[PDB]
Amino acid sequence: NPWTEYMAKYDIEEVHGSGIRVDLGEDAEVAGTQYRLPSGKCPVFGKGIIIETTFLKPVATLKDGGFAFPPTNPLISPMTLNGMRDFYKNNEYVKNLDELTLCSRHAGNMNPDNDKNSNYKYPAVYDYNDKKCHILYIAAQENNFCFRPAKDKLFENYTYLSKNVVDNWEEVCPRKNLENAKFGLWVDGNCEDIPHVNEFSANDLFECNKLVFELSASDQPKDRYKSHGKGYNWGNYNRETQKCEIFNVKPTCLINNSSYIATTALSHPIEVE
């Protein structure tokens, strides 16, 4: 299989290794109590939280706040990319990280246990629009104060980042959708179609990507609950028949077809290559 190296980033179970829709693939102890927290190694492009008044607002210190960190001194959240690089200008192992990894490491730098070295590290959202890193004080992603994770037009520049986001995600994680390409399975020297797919109608690539995300790996219904990256993470979008062909086994090659755009739950809902 000549596709092995190229198709490695689409082995979401191996490169991401956790839930996508709801990421709670690890546990951390904060002073005698275990908590669930995100642990996906890949960034989730376009993911945000919909509150049934926006989740990037700071946590309430009334009764209706958001998911983000409360105001701090010095203000470490929200913090711009340049603000972060300046903050870590003496740390050569951090100051030159890509914006997503840096945001992840910045969030993971904040220890809640002020008297001991705990392993709890907050998730984060990087907004490409403002170039701002938002540390999420609340790691919860769905509760149905009801809320749910989703891909949305409002969220297209958001990126959901766990503590485990690898510094080489650009090389090993998906981002762009593959235009004129179709996910397939390599068999006997030929790339065959995915034998069984679940067809969901979708008006455009965005809605297909949204659907895949809704059906993808989830660490919370509606260990034990951990998906470990297993799920309906991939989708072949036929732009002509407007079919989002969704499946749950990893693809191992590409098929040239001008009618198709290959997408994943981790991928950006718009960007193509």
């Binding site: 701090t72 001194n73 010095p74 740390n91 730098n109 246990d113 002020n114």
Partner: peptide
């Protein structure tokens, strides 16, 4: 309040 993990450590409230 939080404590930074990377050096040098500080309290951020």
């Amino acid at each position: 309040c939080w404590t930074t993990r990377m050096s040098p450590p500080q309290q951020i409230c």
